[PDB]
Amino acid sequence: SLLIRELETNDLDNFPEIDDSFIVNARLMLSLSKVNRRIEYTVEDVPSYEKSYLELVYNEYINKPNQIIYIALLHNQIIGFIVLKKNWNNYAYIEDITVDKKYRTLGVGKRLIAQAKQWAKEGNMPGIMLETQNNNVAACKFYEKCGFVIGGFDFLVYKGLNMTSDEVAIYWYLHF
Amino acid sequence: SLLIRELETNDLDNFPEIDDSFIVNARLMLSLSKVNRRIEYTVEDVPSYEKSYLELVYNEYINKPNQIIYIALLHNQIIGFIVLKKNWNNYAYIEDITVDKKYRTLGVGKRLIAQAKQWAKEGNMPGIMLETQNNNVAACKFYEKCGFVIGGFDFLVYKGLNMTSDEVAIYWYLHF
Numbered sequence A, B: 001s002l003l004i005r006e007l008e009t010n011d012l013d014n015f016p017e018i019d020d021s022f023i024v025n026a027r028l029m030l031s032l033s034k035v036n037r038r039i040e041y042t043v044e045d046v047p048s049y050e051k052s053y054l055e056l057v058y059n060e061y062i063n064k065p066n067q068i069i070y071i072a073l074l075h076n077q078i079i080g081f082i083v084l085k086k087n088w089n090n091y092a093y094i095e096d097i098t099v100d101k102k103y104r105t106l107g108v109g110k111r112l113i114a115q116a117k118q119w120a121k122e123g124n125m126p127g128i129m130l131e132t133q134n135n136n137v138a139a140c141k142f143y144e145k146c147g148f149v150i151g152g153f154d155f156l157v158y159k160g161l162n163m164t165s166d167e168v169a170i171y172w173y174l175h176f
């Protein structure tokens, strides 16, 4: 069965092309309730398109006290990975989680998250967090299934790259 | 009169103790309108207390392509400074702006912001941004007077440091 383990220098050249692309078919619409500052959302369909999530240099995460990469291995091949760092607020921060396109929805991502939680706890980190865009509904639903909640959002940060679009950053948190 | 110029190595030992403390006397209460995703706020008084804004190592900002420190000089003394970097979204990012307590409300901060805008433009940066806490109403009003608008907020990021309090991060933006 599937194995999740820490990335090693010797894995760097055996690292295959992993398809991190996904289909954007909808977007989250955010709202702020007056009850417990709860950020809520509704889903709105948008004309579909494909995009790649992704600079990430794997070697920068090998042999480091506060950052690490875990890889998912199935039938002698790396089929997914998770990139983690310790953030300024003490939480573990997911820089990137990717499962090869052909193997998604089969529980690999949840197993990567479970390992990330172990790493966070081993380092005395009180939770895990990450940022995603409101047009990555697949990822949003995945984090929600994993126990994460929306703690914040930002309507202007993406304008610095492109002023035409209306991409929104969403910040997700899982507290232990 | 006042002089604003780039920090030099030779200024490092002539750098005096600058009082960056401020009095917290209120906090911003955020809301999200349905019109143009406008984030609004109201001010609520809170029992007052003093806190220091501030690791920042000035030497890390000397002789760098994408980061810099400008100092404010008055009567042979450094009375304020602004710390800037280029962010991932291309905006100039204010890591810290401080005017010595005794000289506040006399226009020094606005002059530091003006210089930061020049630096941003010289580097082809499309705007300037920063993060502050909802309990720093003085800073919030100052940014608002300087033309900044609220682009986002986060209710959980501060929980990683302290779970008892309810500090909220506010992200401000000035687009050119």
Ligand SMILES: CC(=O)SCCNC(=O)CCNC(=O)[C@H](O)C(C)(C)COP(=O)(O)OP(=O)(O)OC[C@H]1O[C@@H](n2cnc3c(N)ncnc32)[C@H](O)[C@@H]1OP(=O)(O)O
Binding pocket: A020, A021, A022, A053, A094, A095, A096, A097, A098, A099, A100, A103, A104, A105, A106, A107, A108, A109, A110, A111, A130, A131, A132, A136, A137, A138, A139, A141, A142, A143, A145, A146
């Ligand atoms: C910080 C960041 O990295 S943000 C970017 C995240 N990465 C990407 O978007 C790259 C492309 N996407 C992917 O690689 C994958 O879709 C991942 C990593 C997000 C998820 O990995 P997967 O292995 O597919 O997730 P997994 O099968 O473990 O799903 C776990 C749960 O989430 C749910 N889920 C997963 N994908 C979806 C989806 N597209 N829509 C709805 N629910 C979903 C599953 O149904 C499952 O729920 P359950 O526990 O109730 O059965």
Ligand SMILES: CC(=O)SCCNC(=O)CCNC(=O)[C@H](O)C(C)(C)COP(=O)(O)OP(=O)(O)OC[C@H]1O[C@@H](n2cnc3c(N)ncnc32)[C@H](O)[C@@H]1OP(=O)(O)O
Binding pocket: B020, B021, B022, B053, B094, B095, B096, B097, B098, B099, B100, B103, B104, B105, B106, B107, B108, B109, B110, B111, B130, B131, B132, B136, B137, B138, B139, B141, B142, B143, B145, B146
């Ligand atoms: C990213 C970060 O650094 S967030 C932390 C910001 N830094 C701090 O909080 C450190 C402590 N505070 C300070 O150092 C100063 O208060 C600063 C840097 C925020 C502002 O510097 P100052 O030199 O006092 O500001 P300056 O006098 O230029 O004020 C410019 C405008 O803002 C307004 N303003 C300044 N302080 C306040 C205040 N406390 N309340 C209301 N309005 C204010 C001024 O009235 C002025 O408005 P005008 O142009 O309409 O006359």
Ligand SMILES: [K+]
Binding pocket: A053, A131, A132, A133, A136, A139
């Ligand atoms: K995303």
Ligand SMILES: [K+]
Binding pocket: B053, B131, B132, B133, B136, B139
């Ligand atoms: K602040």
